[PDB]
C-alpha cells in the first residue's frame, strides 16, 4: 500500500481558484456589500466562513446583499484572505476588518487579530 | 372594532422572562464558556440572535459549548443584554464584548459599540 | 459604562416569533379546542397565561385538549391577542372572549372588556 | 502591515469539503459512473481537475455520464485522493487507477505513479 | 431516386490528406512537443480528439505547447494513428502511448491498451 | 503486434464534421452562389473537390462567389452529397445537377448520373 | 497621339495558331483522350481554359492524359471550337460535347447550348 | 448545325494573355535588349512577328538578345501593341519606334506609321 | 612557314561575281519584287542577308517572289550594295532602302543608315 | 549623295563562308580527291578557280571526281586557303601542292611559290 | 567481211600536221607568249588540251595571249611535244616546262614528269 | 637525257575527234553531197586527202557541194573511215566506195580495196 | 553579123596536137609511170584533167612521177583517150582503166565506164 | 572492145581554155601588136596555126611582137575565133580580118570569107 502527498497542492489550488474569482470564472454568487457588487463560488464561502455556510444552507439565492454595517473594503480584504491565507492592511483598519472577521465566525483569525492588538497595547 | 395598545406589555413579559431565566425555571439550554455554566431558553436565544436561530435550527442540542475564543464575562454581559436590553460594564472591556456581539451578528449593538469606542479614542 | 435601549426590539421579536408560529417552526406544542389542533410554543403560551404557566410546570404533554366548553374563534382570537398584541372581532362574539380570557387570567384584558360592555350598557 | 499564515488552514478545508461530499451537502452534480451514481459539486471539480474545468465550461448539466471505460471504483479511489490528496490502492490496481488519473489530467500524480512503477520493475 | 456510396471515399480522403500533413501543406496549428514543432491541421483535430476540439474553442493560437510530462515519441506515434489510424511502437513504450491517449480522451483506445496489457500480463 | 480498424469511424467524423457546418459551427468559408451565401469548411471542400481544391490553393479569400451560372438548388444538393455522400432530387432537375458536377469535378457521379440519363431514354 | 486598332489582328492570329496546330509546329504539350494523341501548345490552353491553366500552373508534364470519361471525338470538337470560335456537329453529339464543355469550365459556351437544347424541346 | 460567334473572346483573351506577361505567368521567354531583360511569351511573340516566327524556329533558347541598335523604349512599346494592338508614344519617337517595327516585320503596321509620318509632313 | 595575303583578292573576287551576275551567268535564283524579274545567286544572299539564309533553308525555289510592300528599286540598289559594299541613292529614298534593310536584317547597314538619318534630323 | 566602304566586310563575309564549309551547310558540290569526298559551294570554286568557272559552266554535276594524280592533302590546303586566303604546310610538301595550285591557274600563287622557292635556292 | 588498220596512218597524219604548222601554212590561231608569236591550229589545239578546248568554245578569236608567267621557250617545247609526241630539254628547265603542262592540264605528261623528278631526286 | 611515247595517244585523240564531230562541235565545213549535208572539221579533211589539201588551197567556203556523181552514203564510209580508220560497208557497193576513195585520191586505199576486189574475182 | 562554126575544126585541131605529142613536138612534161617515160605537153593535161590544172598550178616541173599505183599502160590508153576522145582496150583492162579515169576527175568518162561495167555484170 | 565517144568534149575543152586564158591563167606567152599587149598559150597557137607553129618552132621567146602591119584589133578577133570558132565584127571590118589570117595561114577561113565578101558583091 502506498500514501501520496503533495504539500503544496493546496496553495496550487487555492491560488488557481483566487485567479478564476478574480477572472469571474464559475461564480455562482453575487455579494453585495455596500453597494459593491462581488461574485463569487457558493461552495468555497461556505466550507471557509460558518456564516455563510448556513447562509448557503439556509438560503439558495444567486445574489446575498450583506448587512450595511459590513464595510465593502473590508469585506474586500477578508474575500482575499480567504482565496490566499494572506491578509495586509492598513493599521487603522484592523479594527473594522477584524470587525467583520467576527461576523464570519472565523476564530482561529480573531484569535491572531485580539493577539496583534493586545500586542500593540503593550 | 375597538383598538388596545399595551406599550409596557413587551417590557413586562421580557422582565418575566428574565426572572423566569434567572430562577432556573423552564431553561432548556446550557451554555457552557471557558468553563462557566450557563442556563437559558432556547426560543428566546434563537429569537435574539440570528447565530443562535440558525444554530438551534440545525442542533437541536441541551447543551451547547461555546468556542474557547469567547470569554464567560462578556458574554454574561451580552446575556443579560438579550434579557434585559441593559449593559453595563468597565471602559477597559468594551473591545472584548463587542468581540463577542460582533460574532453574535447583533449588528445595532456592534454598531452602537464602534461609534462609542470612536468618541473615546477622540 | 453606557446604556443601549431599543424601544421596537421587542415589537420587532414578537412579530418574528408569530411569525414562525404560523410557519410551523419550532412550535412544542399543539393545543386541541374542540376538534380543531393549533400549533404553538410552550414557552410563550407559559409566559402568557398564569393557567398555561401552572398547566406546564405541572403537565409536560406535547398536546393540550382544552374542555369542550371553551369556543374554538374566542381561542384563535385571544391566540392571536397573544402572538400579536391585537384582537378584532364582532361585537357579539365579545362575551364568549371574555369568557375565554378570564380562564386564562389575562386581568387586564379582562377588565378592559368588561369595561367596553359596560359602556356598550351604557 | 501584519502577515497571517495558517498552514492547516486548507487541509481543514479539505476536510470539511470531503466530509460534505459524503453526507450529501451542497452537491450539485451526480456523476454517472458504470451504473454507479456518485454525488459532488462543481466547482471542487473544475478547480482540481483541468479535464472537469473544461468539461463544466462547456456543459452545466446537473449528471455527467462518464466514459464506459472509466471504472467505478478506480474513480472512488481517484475522487478519494481530490478530496484527501491521499490514495491507498492494492497493487495490481495501480494501473487502472493510473490510467483514470491520466484521463483526469493530474500530472504530478502521474509523474509519481510512473516513478514508483518503475521502481517496481527495479 | 438513387443513392451512391464510396466505401474507400473516406479512407482515400485521410490518406490525402495526410500526405499533405507529411507535405507541410495547409497546416495551420504547431504544436511544440518538448521542444519538438509539429504541424497539424485544426478542423481534423478538433474532430478527432475532444480534448483538442474543447481546447480550440477555449483557444485559437496558431502555437500549442502541450504539458512537459508528454512524451514526444508518444505523441507522434500518435499523430500517425490519428491521421492514419493505425499504431506501430514498441511494446515497452506501450504505457506511454496509453498515457498520451487518456490525455487525449481516445477511450476507445484505451480500452484496447488496457486489454492488450493485461493479456500480455498473462 | 496488433491492427485496429474502425469501418464506421470515418463515417461517424464526417457525420460530426457535416452536423458542425450545419449548426455554423467552425465554418471558415462562405459560398455566394445567385446571391445565396453558405457556411462551409475550407479544409473538407479542399480534400473533397479538386476544383474547389485549387481554387483555395490559388486564392485565400474567406468568401468565394461561383458563377452565376451555376444554380442555388443544384449546388445544394451537391454539397449534401459531399457531406452526406447522398443525393435526393426529382428527376426534371438531374439535368442540371449533372452540369454543376462536371465543374465540380465529381467524376464518379458525372459517370454515374451519365448511365442514369441513359438508362432513362432507355 | 495616335489610336491604332486591328479588328481582324486577333482572328488573324488565332488563324495563324491552327495553322501551327495542323501542322504540329511549336504544339509543346501532347494530350492523351481515349488513346488518341492530340498536340497542343499549353499557352494556349491555359488562357483559353481555366481547366486546363490551373492544370499546367500545377503539372509542367509534357504529356496529360485527360479521364477516360472525356469522349475524344467530342473532345476533338470542343478543340476545334477553342481554335477557331466555331463548332459544327450534329444534332445527337451536342450533350457531350456540352459534357465536355463543362468539363473545360466554358461557361458561356455551356450557356448557349442549354439554352439550343430548351429551344430545341420548344 | 449551329454556329456560336463571341466577338470579343479574342480581345478578353488577349487581355488575359497581356496580364500574365505582366506579372510574369507562364512566360517562357527572356529578351534582352539593350541591357534591360524583358520576360514574355515566345508562342505570342512568334504568332506576332514573322521575325520572331524565323528566329524562334531557328534557335530554341529560354533568351534573346536583341542588337544593341534596337532601343528598349520602343521595343516596350511594340511589345504592348502586339499584346493590345495599341500603341501610345510621343511624337519625336515616332521614327525609333517605326524602325524597330520594320525589324519585326509588321508590315500592316509599317504602312500606317508611315502614312501618319506622311501625314504629319503635310 | 610562309604567309601570304592578298588584300584585294576579295574586292576583286566580289567585282567578278557581280559581274557574273549582271550577265546573268551562273545565276540560279529569281527574286519577282512587285512584278520585277531580277537573277542572281543563292549563296551570295544567303551569306550576306540572315534571312536569305534562312528561307534557303526553309525552301529550296529557284523563283522567290517577296511581299508586294518590298520595292523594286529600294531592293536593286540593296542588291547592288551586297555585291558592291557602296550604295548611292537619293536622299529621299533612304527610308525605303532602309525599310527594305531591315528586312534583309543586315544591321551594320542598318546602324549606319540610322546614324546618316539622325545626323540629317540634327 | 553618301558612299560607304566596310573593309572587313569581305573577311567577315569569307569567314562566314568557310565556316558553313566546315559545318557542310548550303554546299552544292562534292569533290573526290584520291578516295577523299569533300564538299563545296559551286559558286565559291567557280569565282576563285578558273577551271572551276569552266568546270562548272560546262557540267552541272554536284558530284567531281578529279584525276586521282592530285593529292588529298594538297587539295584541302589550297582549299584553306581559297576559304582563308592562308595556308600553312611543311617544307618539302611546297611542291606538291605548288603543282595542285597551277592546275586550278593560281597564277599569283604560282608566282609567289616559285619565288619563296628560288629564295630557298639562295 | 574485210577490216583495214593503218598503224602509222595516224603518224604520217601528226609529221604533216608538223611539217604544216613550222611552215607557217593553214594555221589559224596565233598566240602570244611573254612577246613571242606563235602560229598554231585551233582545232588541234582544242583537242590536244583542256584549256585550249574551253578556250575555243568559249572565245573563237584567231589571236590568244596567255598569261605572262607563262614562258616562251618551255611554251615552244610543249607544243613541239604537242606536235610530236616528244620533249628534249635540259634538266634545270623540267620545273618550268612541267608548270606550263599543269595550266595546259596534258595531265599525261605532267604525271610523267613528276615521277621522273622523283626518280632524279632520289 | 629521257624520251617519253604514247603509242595510243594518236588513236585516242582520233576517237575523241571523231565523237566531237558527230556531236556536232567545232565543226567548220559542211559538206554538201546529193542533197545531204554532212558537218566536218575541215582541218581533219584537208589533213587526211591531198585533194582535200587543194580544195582547201584554193577555196576558203564554209559549204562544200561535191559533183552530183558522188553517192552519199559512200562518202559516209570514206568519212567514218577517215575520222575512224576503219571501214564497213556491203559487198556490192564496195566498187562506188573505191571510185569516191579515188576521187579522194587515197592511193592506199584504193590499193588495199583493189587487192581485195581481185581476191575476190580470184 | 555573121557567125561562122566549124564542126571538125576541134577534131583536126586534136588531130594535129596528138600528133605533135607522137612526134615530141612542143612537149613541155616528162611523165614517169612504173619507169616508163612519156613526153606530153602541160596545158593540154590541165586543161582536159582538174587535177592535172591543179598539180601545175600547184608545182611548175619539167618531169611528173605518178604513183606507182598507176599502171604505165592504162595511163596511155587515157592519154590516147584524152588527145583523141577515143578508146579501146580489153575487156579485162576495163578496171585499172576505170581507176586512172577515177583518179584523173574523168566524171563523164567515170559515168560511162560504170554503166558498160554494170552492162557487162547483168 | 569498146569505144566512146564525146561529141561536146572537144567544145567544153576549148571553152575552159578560153577562159583560162582571160584570166590568164598558165599564159606563156605575151603577144604585142600595134603597142598592144596580149597574153596566150604558145601550144594553142602553135598547133592552130602554121605560122605560129614555124614561129615557135624557130624561135622559143616568151613575148613575140607582129609586124606593125597587123591590127590590135582585128588580131583579137582572130584570136577570139581561135579560142572559140565564132567570129563577129562589122563588115567593113571584114577585109582588114581576112587579111590577118592570111598572115596565119587559116586558108578555109580565107575560103570562107572569100565566099561571103563574093555573095555581098554579088
Redesign the interface.
Known amino acids: ?6 504539500p503544496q ?3 496550487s ?2 491560488e ?2 483566487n485567479r ?1 474569482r478574480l477572472e469571474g ?2 461564480c ?1 454568487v453575487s455579494l453585495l456589500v455596500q453597494g459593491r457588487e462581488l461574485r463569487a ?4 464561502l ?3 466562513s460558518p ?1 455563510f455556510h ?1 447562509k ?3 438560503g439558495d439565492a444567486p445574489r446575498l446583499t450583506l ?1 450595511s ?1 459590513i464595510e465593502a473594503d473590508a469585506f474586500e480584504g477578508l474575500l482575499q484572505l480567504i482565496y490566499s ?6 493599521l487603522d483598519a484592523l ?1 473594522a476588518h ?3 472577521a ?2 464570519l ?1 472565523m ?6 487579530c ?1 493577539e ?2 493586545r500586542e500593540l497595547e503593550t
Not at 41 to 44: D, L
Not at 85 to 90: A, C, D, I, V
Not at 107 to 112: A, F, H, M, P, T
Open positions: 500500500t502506498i500514501q501520496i502527498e503533495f497542492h493546496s496553495s489550488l487555492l488557481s481558484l478564476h470564472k464559475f455562482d463560488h457558493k461552495a468555497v461556505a466550507a471557509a456564516y448556513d448557503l444552507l439556509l448587512p454595517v491565507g494572506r491578509l495586509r492592511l492598513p479594527p477584524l470587525l467583520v467576527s461576523g465566525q476564530w482561529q483569525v480573531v484569535d491572531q485580539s496583534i492588538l
